[PDB]
Design a protein around this motif. Structure first.
Motif, PDB file in Angstrom:
ATOM      1  N   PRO B 110       0.823  -1.221   0.000  1.00 58.70           N
ATOM      2  CA  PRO B 110       0.000   0.000   0.000  1.00 58.70           C
ATOM      3  C   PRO B 110       0.860   1.275   0.000  1.00 58.70           C
ATOM      4  O   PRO B 110       0.545   2.265  -0.658  1.00 58.70           O
ATOM      5  N   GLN B 111       1.944   1.229   0.776  1.00 53.44           N
ATOM      6  CA  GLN B 111       2.916   2.327   0.875  1.00 53.44           C
ATOM      7  C   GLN B 111       3.783   2.558  -0.377  1.00 53.44           C
ATOM      8  O   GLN B 111       4.196   3.682  -0.635  1.00 53.44           O
ATOM      9  N   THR B 112       4.119   1.509  -1.124  1.00 54.11           N
ATOM     10  CA  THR B 112       4.887   1.699  -2.370  1.00 54.11           C
ATOM     11  C   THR B 112       3.989   2.411  -3.385  1.00 54.11           C
ATOM     12  O   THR B 112       4.452   3.127  -4.267  1.00 54.11           O
ATOM     13  N   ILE B 113       2.689   2.159  -3.253  1.00 57.12           N
ATOM     14  CA  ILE B 113       1.675   2.813  -4.079  1.00 57.12           C
ATOM     15  C   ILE B 113       1.801   4.318  -3.821  1.00 57.12           C
ATOM     16  O   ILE B 113       1.716   5.136  -4.732  1.00 57.12           O
ATOM     17  N   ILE B 114       2.032   4.637  -2.543  1.00 55.84           N
ATOM     18  CA  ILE B 114       2.253   6.006  -2.053  1.00 55.84           C
ATOM     19  C   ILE B 114       3.385   6.699  -2.835  1.00 55.84           C
ATOM     20  O   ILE B 114       3.387   7.918  -2.984  1.00 55.84           O
ATOM     21  N   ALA B 115       4.352   5.916  -3.319  1.00 58.34           N
ATOM     22  CA  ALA B 115       5.471   6.457  -4.111  1.00 58.34           C
ATOM     23  C   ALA B 115       4.925   7.142  -5.371  1.00 58.34           C
ATOM     24  O   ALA B 115       5.563   8.029  -5.935  1.00 58.34           O
ATOM     25  N   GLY B 116       3.745   6.699  -5.805  1.00 55.13           N
ATOM     26  CA  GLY B 116       3.063   7.309  -6.943  1.00 55.13           C
ATOM     27  C   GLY B 116       2.790   8.780  -6.653  1.00 55.13           C
ATOM     28  O   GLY B 116       2.776   9.617  -7.548  1.00 55.13           O
ATOM     29  N   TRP B 117       2.515   9.070  -5.388  1.00 52.97           N
ATOM     30  CA  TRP B 117       2.296  10.433  -4.913  1.00 52.97           C
ATOM     31  C   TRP B 117       3.542  11.288  -5.169  1.00 52.97           C
ATOM     32  O   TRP B 117       3.430  12.459  -5.500  1.00 52.97           O
ATOM     33  N   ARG B 118       4.748  10.743  -4.965  1.00 54.20           N
ATOM     34  CA  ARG B 118       5.943  11.533  -5.294  1.00 54.20           C
ATOM     35  C   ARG B 118       6.285  11.367  -6.783  1.00 54.20           C
ATOM     36  O   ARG B 118       7.375  10.951  -7.174  1.00 54.20           O
ATOM     37  N   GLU B 119       5.190  11.406  -7.522  1.00 52.40           N
ATOM     38  CA  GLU B 119       5.109  11.445  -8.980  1.00 52.40           C
ATOM     39  C   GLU B 119       3.913  12.327  -9.306  1.00 52.40           C
ATOM     40  O   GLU B 119       3.720  12.786 -10.421  1.00 52.40           O
ATOM     41  N   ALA B 120       3.056  12.454  -8.287  1.00 52.94           N
ATOM     42  CA  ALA B 120       1.946  13.383  -8.295  1.00 52.94           C
ATOM     43  C   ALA B 120       2.599  14.741  -8.388  1.00 52.94           C
ATOM     44  O   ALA B 120       2.080  15.659  -8.985  1.00 52.94           O
ATOM     45  N   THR B 121       3.727  14.852  -7.672  1.00 50.15           N
ATOM     46  CA  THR B 121       4.568  16.042  -7.703  1.00 50.15           C
ATOM     47  C   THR B 121       5.043  16.250  -9.149  1.00 50.15           C
ATOM     48  O   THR B 121       5.074  17.371  -9.659  1.00 50.15           O
ATOM     49  N   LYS B 122       5.378  15.136  -9.814  1.00 49.65           N
ATOM     50  CA  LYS B 122       5.755  15.160 -11.229  1.00 49.65           C
ATOM     51  C   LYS B 122       4.472  14.972 -12.040  1.00 49.65           C
ATOM     52  O   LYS B 122       4.323  14.055 -12.841  1.00 49.65           O
ATOM     53  N   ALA B 123       3.563  15.886 -11.772  1.00 51.72           N
ATOM     54  CA  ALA B 123       2.238  15.972 -12.376  1.00 51.72           C
ATOM     55  C   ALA B 123       1.663  17.311 -11.949  1.00 51.72           C
ATOM     56  O   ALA B 123       1.127  18.081 -12.742  1.00 51.72           O
ATOM     57  N   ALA B 124       1.746  17.531 -10.637  1.00 53.86           N
ATOM     58  CA  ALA B 124       1.342  18.775 -10.007  1.00 53.86           C
ATOM     59  C   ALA B 124       2.174  19.910 -10.587  1.00 53.86           C
ATOM     60  O   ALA B 124       1.652  20.947 -10.981  1.00 53.86           O
ATOM     61  N   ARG B 125       3.493  19.703 -10.623  1.00 53.66           N
ATOM     62  CA  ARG B 125       4.387  20.670 -11.237  1.00 53.66           C
ATOM     63  C   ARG B 125       4.220  20.698 -12.756  1.00 53.66           C
ATOM     64  O   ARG B 125       4.663  21.625 -13.401  1.00 53.66           O
ATOM     65  N   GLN B 126       3.657  19.631 -13.328  1.00 54.78           N
ATOM     66  CA  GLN B 126       3.374  19.589 -14.772  1.00 54.78           C
ATOM     67  C   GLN B 126       2.420  20.718 -15.143  1.00 54.78           C
ATOM     68  O   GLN B 126       2.527  21.281 -16.225  1.00 54.78           O
ATOM     69  N   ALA B 127       1.425  20.981 -14.289  1.00 51.25           N
ATOM     70  CA  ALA B 127       0.505  22.102 -14.524  1.00 51.25           C
ATOM     71  C   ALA B 127       1.317  23.393 -14.588  1.00 51.25           C
ATOM     72  O   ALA B 127       0.858  24.422 -15.079  1.00 51.25           O
ATOM     73  N   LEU B 128       2.505  23.345 -14.006  1.00 52.14           N
ATOM     74  CA  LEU B 128       3.422  24.458 -14.078  1.00 52.14           C
ATOM     75  C   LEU B 128       4.149  24.266 -15.394  1.00 52.14           C
ATOM     76  O   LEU B 128       4.599  23.169 -15.668  1.00 52.14           O
ATOM     77  N   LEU B 129       4.317  25.340 -16.155  1.00 48.16           N
ATOM     78  CA  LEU B 129       4.857  25.291 -17.532  1.00 48.16           C
ATOM     79  C   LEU B 129       3.715  24.864 -18.479  1.00 48.16           C
ATOM     80  O   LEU B 129       3.873  24.748 -19.697  1.00 48.16           O
ATOM     81  N   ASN B 130       2.548  24.682 -17.855  1.00 48.60           N
ATOM     82  CA  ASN B 130       1.287  24.331 -18.510  1.00 48.60           C
ATOM     83  C   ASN B 130       0.311  25.513 -18.461  1.00 48.60           C
ATOM     84  O   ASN B 130      -0.139  25.879 -17.376  1.00 48.60           O
ATOM     85  N   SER B 131       0.047  26.132 -19.623  1.00 44.81           N
ATOM     86  CA  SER B 131      -0.917  27.253 -19.739  1.00 44.81           C
ATOM     87  C   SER B 131      -0.230  28.614 -19.581  1.00 44.81           C
ATOM     88  O   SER B 131       0.239  28.944 -18.491  1.00 44.81           O
ATOM     89  N   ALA B 132      -0.154  29.406 -20.659  1.00 50.62           N
ATOM     90  CA  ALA B 132       0.474  30.732 -20.563  1.00 50.62           C
ATOM     91  C   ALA B 132      -0.295  31.561 -19.535  1.00 50.62           C
ATOM     92  O   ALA B 132      -1.526  31.575 -19.541  1.00 50.62           O
ATOM     93  N   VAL B 133       0.431  32.289 -18.697  1.00 51.38           N
ATOM     94  CA  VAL B 133      -0.202  32.999 -17.586  1.00 51.38           C
ATOM     95  C   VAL B 133      -1.053  34.258 -17.897  1.00 51.38           C
ATOM     96  O   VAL B 133      -2.270  34.206 -17.719  1.00 51.38           O
ATOM     97  N   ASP B 134      -0.458  35.358 -18.390  1.00 47.95           N
ATOM     98  CA  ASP B 134      -1.239  36.599 -18.657  1.00 47.95           C
ATOM     99  C   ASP B 134      -0.366  37.818 -18.987  1.00 47.95           C
ATOM    100  O   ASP B 134      -0.645  38.531 -19.946  1.00 47.95           O
ATOM    101  N   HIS B 135       0.683  38.036 -18.178  1.00 53.04           N
ATOM    102  CA  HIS B 135       1.597  39.181 -18.335  1.00 53.04           C
ATOM    103  C   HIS B 135       0.920  40.536 -17.969  1.00 53.04           C
ATOM    104  O   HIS B 135       0.626  41.349 -18.844  1.00 53.04           O
ATOM    105  N   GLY B 136       0.642  40.751 -16.672  1.00 52.45           N
ATOM    106  CA  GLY B 136      -0.009  41.997 -16.227  1.00 52.45           C
ATOM    107  C   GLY B 136       0.177  42.300 -14.731  1.00 52.45           C
ATOM    108  O   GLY B 136       1.046  41.717 -14.093  1.00 52.45           O
ATOM    109  N   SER B 137      -0.608  43.274 -14.214  1.00 51.75           N
ATOM    110  CA  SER B 137      -0.593  43.681 -12.778  1.00 51.75           C
ATOM    111  C   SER B 137       0.510  44.696 -12.432  1.00 51.75           C
ATOM    112  O   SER B 137       1.675  44.342 -12.266  1.00 51.75           O
TER     113      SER B 137
END
Lengths: 490, 513, 473, 486, 73
Positions: B110-137
């Motif tokens: 069950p815990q090695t499955i948890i290692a998938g979570w420290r790939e969630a990070t390599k998914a969560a950060r995927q949204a980063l560099l994903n979608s141009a932001v805006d350039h304002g404020s």
């Protein structure tokens, strides 16, 4: 435990139940054959009360936990700005709830439907700026004074055999009233019998109280004193201060709105002065405008801080009963109506009917415009609203369509109270309105449809403006929310 | 059958159930056509709090036997650096538990499955560099101030049909709340009646009390007096030794003594130019006659909380005995008035010299649920202050979410082993957001999922879910955008919060009633 | 108070329940999103049976004590006279019973309520002339040949993703068939062939049968023989039943192709095409048999082999073969082509129609509201109940679409009151749209028969005052 | 009677419950390591019956009201053509229904959900050769004919030591079964006796009936007569036409009349009372057939083979043998074996065997066994949800995950944990190596071509189409069994 | 006739007391009309036999004791 905890179908229902209970009660009240109700309560209550007016009865008692008291409260503001007419606005608001039944068929999001209420604002403005009004009314008016809206309020009451004449009298009261400020200084009491006229008009305010058996029978050039307020030897000083100040004025009468000390009572009788115990405050305020008033304070009160009207105050008898009459008011702004009546218990309902007359007429004179009564206005608008739902886009239109069928219930209530079958009446009513005659309406005396204008029945312009906006806003609070109640306890 | 006894595998289901139960309440909130929840609690709770902000409500109460309190606490860390827009972190985490059914199907760690979570990070950060932001404020800024994210934060809220206008108003408040102050004194009150504008912006603090019908209606060059002690008099502390006096009438001077108390109050008051008096308690009747003629507006039993906020606004005061006027008091001087605000009568204090305490006034309609404007604004306040500081955003309406989902699907079986089932579970999590946005609007969710997937796959980042349209449209013209750091932190936080609860199992008890 | 007796409100309820019980099961079936149900019976029934169309299932058995079986028998006459379309007629009849609760509110004699039916003739004329009708159906027709009623009939079916194209095609078939001569003669089969076109119109009748391995492949100047009883230059023999083995050896050597157990439905229509047959005993060959001689052969449409009859001298009737993209959806077209053709035959004969997608129903509803008020007292309340019945139809079409029904009612009414008969309900759109652009029209005839059929079913409850028994003990 | 009330989510639950109970009982049955189960019924059921074959047990009893009887029934037709091998079709069909839980989450319409079947159109074509079935099974085959899949059917069964050989024999039977006369011509009875071979192959049909104690012992140059109508002037007409032909045997499918019985004994003709119809149809193809009707039937309308018919003792239970068929197209196999549990298992195996192999010769297509076909298909379907427009996408991805369980069940009954197995398995198939599959003996993955385990192509096409049909119907309807329509 | 009963009584009595025998209830009208045009006339005897029999039965009835009722059967 907790408080409320409502969601889903049950939440809608608590609001839904409140509307149905009230609508049946008020339904009996509308139109010429309206029903009078006598109320019995043995919960910190002493006797059965009978109220023809739907608004007055709803205000008096808050029977239970479900929300409805606040909706009821709003109608009273309407009464002062235009009056009662016949109670109808509460019923229309309630029927808004019934199509919510077709709404569970929606099975998705009720809130989108809520767009109809915004639509309703557009709709309210559609009747207020449209079909209604009249042409005339230049101020005072020899013949346009009445024979109108007072009659519709009366028509809802059986007494309109001799009573339509009483209604005619009420505008004489409004013409005199106008002037200086709003509606307040008018007092009405019904007598027990003996007149074809069924009424008399009085110069000033009418009161019914005595000081005691001792004291002068009558007074002249009467002067009026009103008080906001009701070692042993020092008691004598209160007696003496009152006498010393009193003799110079020639004081003929004293009116006090409360309990009165025994020592002064004795003194007034020898002097030639009549005093009144626990005089009604409402009577006093009306009296104050009439006599020029005064400033009510401590015993410094007698002299020029007091203004006394000087025509005549005496206890007099009319036909058989003995009453005390205040007469000869310089102001003219406020007068009193005494109804002798044609000895019948219908006469006892004169108090019921004139009170309705009092609120209606003051508004009628300053609004400067009216609508056609007898339900003429409601059917016409109903035919038109069916078309309106089809102009709007489907999300807005569905709510609008439901609002339109609401007007349908009024024709049934007006006719049903008449005594003629409600089913038959609706079909014939709709056909005449559809043709284009605004004047045509429900003739309750006939039991069919007829020309409202010949009757003289008209509604104040103001009653139509305020009720349309009010119905929509109260409705919005209920449907958009599935969990509510209020703050504080536990 | 017949009992609630649970162990090992059945035990897992209670953890499972908690995630599904939380998701249903939160999903309505997640987007441009949310509902509104009130929640009244009996026992050691102050009034029922109606909250539109999902993060606030989960943290406040530990309602029952199933465990989900620990998952809830982590979302706050996201809040500290942001935590808002629309609530979506908790929902995705819940979907993770459904696959645990086939986790027994995969019989091992069950815990090695948890290692998938420290790939969630390599998914969560995927949204980063994903979608141009805006350039304002920038700073203050004439048009980039709003008609953006606040509208989306409030899109979820019921009031959106006319409130998007008030949402626009909120940035003006952040403009005056930037820099020189931090976060303090923001007070917002709604009113029962309706106006098309549905909101007035006042230059200062709003209060609701009146001295009486008499008194000047409006005051100018106002001085503020706050007293810790009431205007009431008699006993003092030292009785006066119980007064004698010879015959009776002389005692009238005692009556006169009361007058002296009025006298001190006016004599000191006139020199200062006193325009308004605020007291947090009972007020003696004599001074009111004085205040009315003088032209000074006083407030009886004013609430202390309003006063403390007000003091920062005015510059403060030192509250003591009748010496209190003059120099010991530090009242501000622009405008204090009672202003008709469409419906109800309210009193407004404004033009504070400090400028670091401010008020926004919202209308609504008249309902218990109306009070959600109270909390709608609280997240409105937080979203905009951040929007100024971040100077970065993402395309809203679920545009970002659909794009990321397509990329995570690709990862699936490509990564061999134990981590393969875990990584793919994360990928379908993104699918619900598109569904939720449309469901609230009044359109069929199933059809929406179908059309949306094809447009994002094509390569158009700008295209997203248009609820008014009922289909997909250009998000940028609408003005709906999401703050940039909300996306970096939210994905990291979701994974970490999810890990602790899955790893923690069930409730323990032994017998039926 | 002993055994089974009923009066006023209680007696009424048994009639009320029978209409409601049928409606929930049948409502699901209506629409592109319709559903098919399986049923298992108590006596002389082998297994659970599933019927897609409402008419087939209702007909087979009269189960329960409450009256409802009689109402059911009527639908089949309608099917023969026009067809299945999508089942909806039964639903309309049931809704009329709901208004009876408010009927008590009128509070007097339920029987003169019936005079409302008398008023229904007024309603009947309303369903007439104040509706869209055709305004176009000249002959063949460039754009409105289809994209209409067949498409709507089609929509209730799952296959309408590529199928709607096939439905459009079916009108080409109707145009050749057109005329007073023998309505029917249309047969279509699927083929495990290739993509997009999903169907090819062709030369003649298609039949999937073979005599046996031994026998000539093709016959020219073919002579056709049809026999009622089982076993010239004779080219082909077609018999509707079992064929005796001895003749089979003979046919192969002769040069004659025969068909064993040929379906009767194919045969009767084939006869009109060939010129007719007198199907008796072996005396049948020669003049008593009328044959057509252009060409009979078994050919492969795109791959698989089937038999085609063509070159009919008479010319009265013709057949569409179709093709498709391999699945159960594809041979569903077999059911759909036959359904589409029949609606059209009525359309040519009547030379009148309306607009589909419920366009016809909303317009009429706006007009019928006026009628109730115009009619006298008793007539008015019964007449209006019929009018509100029409309101449900728009809702049912939309509800099956998976789109919001409340929203739909408002917008639908909105387009119709304007005066534009073209606007209607587009389920594919999810809102309201121009029906004419879709091209949907309904035959004039389908609306008059449905109105007559629904009205009589309603009266079975009212023309007879009571049906059962009271208190024996 | 048209009225059974279940509403909302309740309609799905009745259907949902019937499938869940069957799947756990049937799951242990599959693979070389399958399980035998016993069942009890009372009220004319003597004891506990044990059926290795899942299809046989399901047919026998209708225990309760929850729907499953129709789903259950459509296995036998499947079995009659290809069907069996190992029972997996019921298991896969049942798991489709579990996602209905997700359907409530859908919150809109179960029918638009029914787009999964549209998905099936692409998935059906997608997997009907992108997994690389087989390129062999030419038809007839010297020895690729068996020593493969039949052995696998037997693997779950103990008999695989001496009965592995029995399995080999079934393919020879299959070769004669080739043609359009597909449904009939197979009869097997186990016989008590001895021999390592444990089986004997007859050149003709085997039957178990006798005219009576009287009658000729043996018939040579035999004429065979089949009558539709029973034997129950009639005596003489039968002898008169019988004599000229030389008639040696009469077979009647029903009751026989006593008067002719005396005549047959003296005549030299063997008749059979109440002979089963199924044997008769098979015989007609074999003997060239005849037209069976009334007593006019003799001479030319009757065709009869004449090589040899006799009644003999195999070793136990007396039987009658028909042999020497001129056509050669159809024949019959008799199994002897050396007495024990293993021997009666023989009856079980070719019931299963002839049908599996019959389609195998005709199809010219088969697939790699041990789950090889299922994993490769699973990897391929991941691509598919994106490829379709969208409504059809969510529907495709749900169908795709179903295939994952099959690898898990084979590993599960192999004595190894499936988590490692699922993870390692997917990488091998994804790579593109078709031969590689799950090796239970290995505990990991290997080349099953060496094993010789292959599945017929038909078992895969029928399961996917049947699963599709036996799902859409069950979810849709809430009125199940009681009385007739509406 | 389907028409409201209280309204009907009112119109009916005014016409009969008026002096016109022909006028009566018209069910088809839902009001009152000329019975003769309809062609409706009850046999005279039906009205007298009913009234006389009821009268005699009444004589015995409120001068007895044992009885009750359920229905015809």
């Amino acid at each position: 435990a907790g408080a409320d905890e409502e969601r889903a179908e049950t939440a809608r229902l608590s609001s839904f139940i409140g509307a149905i209970a009230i609508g049946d009660l008020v339904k009996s009240t509308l139109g010429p054959k309206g029903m009078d109700k006598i109320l019995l309560s043995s919960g910190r209550d002493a006797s059965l009360m009978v109220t023809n007016d739907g608004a007055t009865i709803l205000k008096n008692i808050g029977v239970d936990n479900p929300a409805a008291k606040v909706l009821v409260d709003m109608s009273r503001v309407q009464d002062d700005e235009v009056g009662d007419g016949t109670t109808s606005v509460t019923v229309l608001a309630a029927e808004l709830l019934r199509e919510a039944e077709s709404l569970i068929a929606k099975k998705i999001h009720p809130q989108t439907i809520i767009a109809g209420w915004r639509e309703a604002t557009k709709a309210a403005r559609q009747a207020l700026l449209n079909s209604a009004v009249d042409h005339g009314s230049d101020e005072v008016k020899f013949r346009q004074d009445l024979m109108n809206i007072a009659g519709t309020t009366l028509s809802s009451k059986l007494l309109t055999h001799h009573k339509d004449h009483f209604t005619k009298l009420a505008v004489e009261a409004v013409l005199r009233l106008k002037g200086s400020g709003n509606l307040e200084a008018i007092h009405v009491i019904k007598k027990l019998g003996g007149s074809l006229a069924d009424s008399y008009l009085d110069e000033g305010f009418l009161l019914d109280k005595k000081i005691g058996v001792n004291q002068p029978k009558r007074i002249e050039n009467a002067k009026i004193l009103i008080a906001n307020t009701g070692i042993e030897h020092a008691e004598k000083e209160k007696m003496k201060e009152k006498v010393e100040r009193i003799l110079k004025h020639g004081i003929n009468c004293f009116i006090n709105r409360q309990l009165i000390y025994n020592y002064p009572e004795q003194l007034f009788g020898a002097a030639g002065v009549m005093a009144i115990e626990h005089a009604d405050f409402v009577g006093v305020e009306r009296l104050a405008l009439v006599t020029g008033g005064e400033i009510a304070s401590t015993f410094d009160h007698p002299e020029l801080v007091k203004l006394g009207s000087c025509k005549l105050i005496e206890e007099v008898m009319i036909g058989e009963d003995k009453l005390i009459h205040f007469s000869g008011v310089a102001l003219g702004e406020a007068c009193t109506i005494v109804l002798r009546g044609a000895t019948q218990q219908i006469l006892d309902e004169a108090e019921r009917s004139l009170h309705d007359a009092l609120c209606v007429l003051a508004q009628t004179v300053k609004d400067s415009r009216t609508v056609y009564g007898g339900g003429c206005s409601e059917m016409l608008m109903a035919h038109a609203v069916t078309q309106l739902a089809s102009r709007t886009p489907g999300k807005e239109a569905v709510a609008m369509e439901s609002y339109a069928k609401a007007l349908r219930m009024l024709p049934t209530i007006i006719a049903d109270n008449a005594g003629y079958d409600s089913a038959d009446l609706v079909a014939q009513l709709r056909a005449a309105h559809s043709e284009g005659k605004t004047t045509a309406g429900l003739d309750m005396k006939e039991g069919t449809i007829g020309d409202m204008s010949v009757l003289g029945i008209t509604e104040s312009f103001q009653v139509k403006r305020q009720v349309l906006l009010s119905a929509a806003e109260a409705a919005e609070v209920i449907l958009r929310v599935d969990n509510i109640i209020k703050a504080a306890p536990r």
